């Protein structure tokens, strides 16, 4: 095989999403997801207190993105980032959680590119 698969998501804050796997190297999977879970843990107060409906979808898009054919990268839309940031920034400031440089919302797409660049995914 290729050495990669869609692996079950084991990040504790990325359960009960519309999808349940993410693209990972087979041998490095548990290690990679353990590292992602560690990186995501500082955001737990925001996820638990639910300051934004957009926050968990945004973070899980970055740490456990939907599994695509050939492992293609997917990204959340800039507007999602911006609303998650705005709605959760008071609580992030209260708990000393900085917004990482690699999450600066200007880095994310406007979601106005022709299909398949921007698309809608349906879930039953």
């Amino acid at each position: 095989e290729t050495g990669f698969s869609c692996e079950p998501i084991t990040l504790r804050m990325c359960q009960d999403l519309p999808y349940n796997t993410t693209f990972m190297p087979n041998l490095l999977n548990h290690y990679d997801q353990q590292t992602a879970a560690l990186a995501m843990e500082p955001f737990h107060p925001m996820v638990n207190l639910d300051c934004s409906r957009d926050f968990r979808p945004f973070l899980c898009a970055l740490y456990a993105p939907i599994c695509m054919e050939y492992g293609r990268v997917t990204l959340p839309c800039r507007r999602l980032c911006q609303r998650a940031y705005s709605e959760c920034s008071k609580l992030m400031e209260m708990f000393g959680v900085p917004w990482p440089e690699d999450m600066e919302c200007s880095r994310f797409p406007d979601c106005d590119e022709p299909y398949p660049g921007t698309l809608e995914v349906l879930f039953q």
Partner: nanobody
Amino acid sequence: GQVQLVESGGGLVQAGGSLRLSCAASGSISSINAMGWYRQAPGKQRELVAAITSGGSTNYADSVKGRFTISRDNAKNTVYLQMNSLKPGDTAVYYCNLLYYIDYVEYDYWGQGTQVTVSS
């Protein structure tokens, strides 16, 4: 069922002394929440001191690390600030807050303030 936070435990101590602030929230509140301690010196901006989620996660301002401890009694909906090794620079009015969300609508309540004064 109306929500109010009431503060106590401030006063005057000499430098090196200790104080314990208490902030008791009464009324109908969400059991998943954050509670914080803030302070404001006369004429200056209000500043975060420490915060704690209902789960027990804490955050501390650098200026108070190792000296102050925040803790809570969820049974009592009360948050505490144990203030050891007090310095004159800790003099300020101390405020507690209670922060939670219901269907993503923010609720942010504040206590009435308690004066802390640390003499030379």
